[PDB]
Design an enzyme around this catalytic site. Sequence first.
Site, short mmCIF file in Angstrom:
data_model
loop_
_atom_site.label_atom_id
_atom_site.label_comp_id
_atom_site.label_asym_id
_atom_site.label_seq_id
_atom_site.Cartn_x
_atom_site.Cartn_y
_atom_site.Cartn_z
N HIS A 1 0.20 -3.76 7.00
CA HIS A 1 -1.18 -3.78 7.53
C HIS A 1 -2.23 -4.40 6.58
O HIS A 1 -3.37 -4.68 6.97
CB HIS A 1 -1.61 -2.35 7.79
CG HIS A 1 -1.82 -1.58 6.50
ND1 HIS A 1 -0.77 -0.95 5.84
CD2 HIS A 1 -2.93 -1.34 5.76
CE1 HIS A 1 -1.25 -0.37 4.76
NE2 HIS A 1 -2.54 -0.59 4.70
N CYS B 1 0.89 -1.15 0.00
CA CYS B 1 0.00 0.00 0.00
C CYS B 1 0.93 1.21 0.00
O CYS B 1 2.16 1.06 0.04
CB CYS B 1 -0.82 -0.05 1.31
SG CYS B 1 -2.47 0.80 1.21
N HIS C 1 3.96 6.05 3.29
CA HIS C 1 3.79 7.37 3.92
C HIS C 1 4.58 7.37 5.23
O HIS C 1 5.01 8.42 5.73
CB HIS C 1 2.34 7.68 4.33
CG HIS C 1 1.33 7.93 3.20
ND1 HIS C 1 1.64 8.64 2.04
CD2 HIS C 1 0.03 7.57 3.10
CE1 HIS C 1 0.55 8.68 1.29
NE2 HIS C 1 -0.42 8.05 1.91
N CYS D 1 -7.64 -4.40 2.87
CA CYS D 1 -7.41 -2.96 2.57
C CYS D 1 -7.61 -2.61 1.05
O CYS D 1 -8.72 -2.28 0.62
CB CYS D 1 -6.00 -2.52 2.97
SG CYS D 1 -5.96 -0.70 3.29
N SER E 1 0.19 3.94 2.08
CA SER E 1 0.08 4.32 3.47
C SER E 1 1.09 3.52 4.29
O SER E 1 1.15 3.62 5.52
CB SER E 1 -1.34 4.09 3.98
OG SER E 1 -2.00 5.33 4.17
N1 NAD Z 1 -9.06 5.83 3.36
C1 NAD Z 1 -8.41 4.66 3.57
O1 NAD Z 1 -8.70 3.87 4.44
C2 NAD Z 1 -7.23 4.35 2.59
C3 NAD Z 1 -7.05 2.98 2.27
C4 NAD Z 1 -6.02 2.76 1.37
C5 NAD Z 1 -5.20 3.69 0.79
N2 NAD Z 1 -5.46 5.01 1.16
C6 NAD Z 1 -4.64 6.08 0.54
O2 NAD Z 1 -5.09 6.30 -0.77
C7 NAD Z 1 -3.96 6.53 -1.66
C8 NAD Z 1 -3.96 5.51 -2.79
O3 NAD Z 1 -3.35 4.28 -2.32
P1 NAD Z 1 -2.49 3.39 -3.34
O4 NAD Z 1 -1.87 2.21 -2.67
O5 NAD Z 1 -3.25 2.92 -4.52
O6 NAD Z 1 -1.31 4.44 -3.82
P2 NAD Z 1 -0.44 4.56 -5.11
O7 NAD Z 1 0.83 5.30 -4.94
O8 NAD Z 1 -0.13 3.25 -5.74
O9 NAD Z 1 -1.44 5.39 -6.03
C9 NAD Z 1 -1.21 6.79 -6.30
C10 NAD Z 1 -1.72 7.04 -7.68
O10 NAD Z 1 -1.99 8.45 -7.92
C11 NAD Z 1 -1.33 8.87 -9.08
N3 NAD Z 1 -0.95 10.26 -9.00
C12 NAD Z 1 0.15 10.82 -8.43
N4 NAD Z 1 0.14 12.15 -8.53
C13 NAD Z 1 -1.03 12.44 -9.21
C14 NAD Z 1 -1.61 13.64 -9.62
N5 NAD Z 1 -1.09 14.84 -9.38
N6 NAD Z 1 -2.78 13.56 -10.31
C15 NAD Z 1 -3.33 12.33 -10.55
N7 NAD Z 1 -2.87 11.16 -10.21
C16 NAD Z 1 -1.71 11.28 -9.53
C17 NAD Z 1 -0.17 7.93 -9.21
O11 NAD Z 1 0.32 7.89 -10.56
C18 NAD Z 1 -0.79 6.60 -8.78
O12 NAD Z 1 -1.50 5.89 -9.80
C19 NAD Z 1 -2.72 6.56 -0.78
O13 NAD Z 1 -2.30 7.86 -0.34
C20 NAD Z 1 -3.19 5.69 0.40
O14 NAD Z 1 -2.40 6.03 1.55
C21 NAD Z 1 -6.44 5.34 2.06
ZN ZN Z 2 -3.85 0.29 3.09
#
Ligand code: NAD
Ligand code: ZN
Lengths: 374, 374
Positions: free
Chosen positions: A67, A46, A51, A174, A48
């Site tokens: 996680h 993930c 992060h 997740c 996060s």
């Molecule tokens: N709310 C929750 O419980 C929860 C659960 C999971 C993940 N998240 C969060 O959501 C996000 C997505 O998770 P992930 O594992 O898929 O991350 P990831 O890094 O794989 O996905 C990020 C994506 O956004 C794109 N991106 C980057 N900059 C951009 C921009 N300016 N405009 C458009 N797209 C852009 C990237 O190219 C990529 O496809 C993370 O920050 C994660 O921490 C939250």
């Molecule tokens: Zn997650």
Amino acid sequence: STAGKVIKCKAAVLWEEKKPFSIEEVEVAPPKAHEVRIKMVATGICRSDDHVVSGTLVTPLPVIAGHEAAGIVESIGEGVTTVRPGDKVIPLFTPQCGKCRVCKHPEGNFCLKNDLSMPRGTMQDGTSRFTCRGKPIHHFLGTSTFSQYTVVDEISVAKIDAASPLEKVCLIGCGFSTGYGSAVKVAKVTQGSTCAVFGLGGVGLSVIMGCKAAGAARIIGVDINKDKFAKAKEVGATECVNPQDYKKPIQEVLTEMSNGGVDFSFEVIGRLDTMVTALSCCQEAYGVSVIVGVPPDSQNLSMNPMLLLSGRTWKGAIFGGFKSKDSVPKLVADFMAKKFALDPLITHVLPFEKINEGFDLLRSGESIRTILTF
Amino acid sequence: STAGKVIKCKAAVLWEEKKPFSIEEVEVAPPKAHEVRIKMVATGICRSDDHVVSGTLVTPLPVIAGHEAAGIVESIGEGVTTVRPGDKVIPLFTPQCGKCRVCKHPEGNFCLKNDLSMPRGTMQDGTSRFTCRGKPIHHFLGTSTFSQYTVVDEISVAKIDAASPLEKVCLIGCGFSTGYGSAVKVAKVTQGSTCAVFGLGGVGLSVIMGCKAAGAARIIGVDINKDKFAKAKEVGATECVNPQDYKKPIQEVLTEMSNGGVDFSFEVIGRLDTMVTALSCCQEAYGVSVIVGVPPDSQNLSMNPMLLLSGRTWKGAIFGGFKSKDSVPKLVADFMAKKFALDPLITHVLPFEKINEGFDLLRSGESIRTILTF
Ligand SMILES: NC(=O)c1ccc[n+]([C@@H]2O[C@H](COP(=O)([O-])OP(=O)(O)OC[C@H]3O[C@@H](n4cnc5c(N)ncnc54)[C@H](O)[C@@H]3O)[C@@H](O)[C@H]2O)c1
Ligand SMILES: [Zn+2]
Ligand SMILES: NC(=O)c1ccc[n+]([C@@H]2O[C@H](COP(=O)([O-])OP(=O)(O)OC[C@H]3O[C@@H](n4cnc5c(N)ncnc54)[C@H](O)[C@@H]3O)[C@@H](O)[C@H]2O)c1
Ligand SMILES: [Zn+2]
Ligand SMILES: [Zn+2]
Ligand SMILES: [Zn+2]
């Protein structure tokens, strides 16, 4: 290992913010009444989780991150009712319980007993279950699944099938069911709408494959990595837009496409600027923009209260607003029953100990959800 | 009246931002291709009528303000069979058409044939309908009810109960509808809940009524006018509160009271900092804040995307989510059944001209709803 007493296994401890992981020897203490140490099979990378190496998500270091994982149980504690050993269970970063008015509200999710809104960095009594050199290492949220073992409480361990693909079905702890549950629970995509999904990653494909089930006649995808557009169109992503190819601001374009704006829009990156651009790109009068993502800590977005005043509902969600301990088991019998597909996400499946190239794919670019196997 | 072509009358113009209303004679022309001319019975002084004056609600000038009023028809134009001459009507500030999206949409209330999103001086035609001097005077919303006669647009107007008090129901043009519309339609207040209400005046009093009918147990209203604290119990509230009695942020006082936080937090003030303090004031994971109030110009506010990420939903709305031409009719009609009260809201019926006093009654605290008979 295996036991009743102290297991001496391997893990990936962060010792410092911005450095790679040290695969090491740590010693996981036998569980404490109502806990359930679990022998790890597979894990997910993930963001996060990343992060935490930057420190965009702040938790007490030193810590065994991780996680989003699946594995089998060995030892359980005193009075443990829910899961018995030899059991395939999947650890819960957002627990459930029974009392806290959020656990007892029809529309809650986020259990008062989490460790996400202001992290202790330990177990549910304040102590570790992870000691390295001689220094106890911190658990993360309440799962820490980058070890070979881990000890989670009871309220955050969901128990699934027994014929379940854990090299697959670990994306449900997740990944999938937060991007899935956003689109079908938290936003509620109306049958036949226009959906815009900023960020085309792991969680942001499940959110587009949640819209596509929700009916959604249209679904656009905005990523600055045109490389992502395929695994996307392939998931039910009708029109993909790259904001970099454009002169005028992207809300406009996005808003000139569906002109007026898109019924629903979701942010799955976690950038204060996109977290608003997604709100501006929907409809004044009935545009429902939801944020899934996780921003750079204590950082403030500069918004106009007028954006909201015409009639846009702004929401947010951790998980898919899915009640953790009765939604994760339920969400597996479905995959098993070809409700969805977890395969189109998964780009790699690396051995644990190469968990440092694992992160470096994700972040060092394109190659969406690797799965380190233990 | 002798109605066929132009008239002259008294209008309360506002030639300049900051200065009182000059009841000039003003000559108002005949209804055109579609509109209706109305002679005014009553009008209320809504704060939004005050905003134009400050410099915080910018429509062009010079202008006849006003938008909360009941009256009867005189003239009626061509291509019409909605409201016939000598027929009670309530001018509307957020029209209809049935032409557009928001209008065809079951949940859209912001038509999109309006003048509050981009104030124009109006008239759908793009024109005049007022001239104080040899100078054309502007329209406030598709209305301007601070003149003896005004000529709206048939898209923004409405036929009502026939045997209906235009001195009790000019308040169904805003004040009450929005208050109650924002609690029962846009918040969908629940039963048993605890809604907190920011601003205990005009509209914020009607919100303390849906909250009572929507069917809830505690309605905590927060004002800095201890004086405002009884209508607030008469009409609903239990607890009443003053941020100035406190050494701690009102956020907290209010977060232990419901300790865990409120359930449905509303804001009807127009305070960018009260907009947030209420964001914060509901349950981290299942609270709904409805921004009622109209903020300063293009002044933005700060917050971190984590008040929303935890689960609170942040909507907003104009009017009270109440479509325009279908409600004021049936609403008024509810009044007749003595299905709701409109007086604990009204404190002063002052004759027009004596308007620069009702305004001077707001700005103070002596007045809630100073109705302006004609
Ligand atoms: N709310 C929750 O419980 C929860 C659960 C999971 C993940 N998240 C969060 O959501 C996000 C997505 O998770 P992930 O594992 O898929 O991350 P990831 O890094 O794989 O996905 C990020 C994506 O956004 C794109 N991106 C980057 N900059 C951009 C921009 N300016 N405009 C458009 N797209 C852009 C990237 O190219 C990529 O496809 C993370 O920050 C994660 O921490 C939250
Ligand atoms: Zn997650
Ligand atoms: N969204 C819409 O369509 C709509 C409709 C009507 C009114 N409004 C807006 O809603 C707001 C309320 O209008 P109203 O007619 O009831 O005005 P009002 O003057 O009668 O109400 C304001 C009240 O809130 C109290 N207040 C102000 N600042 C406060 C603070 N810092 N802390 C606590 N209490 C505070 C004031 O003492 C006053 O009694 C205004 O900004 C108005 O422009 C919007
Ligand atoms: Zn709980
Ligand atoms: Zn319309
Ligand atoms: Zn008003």
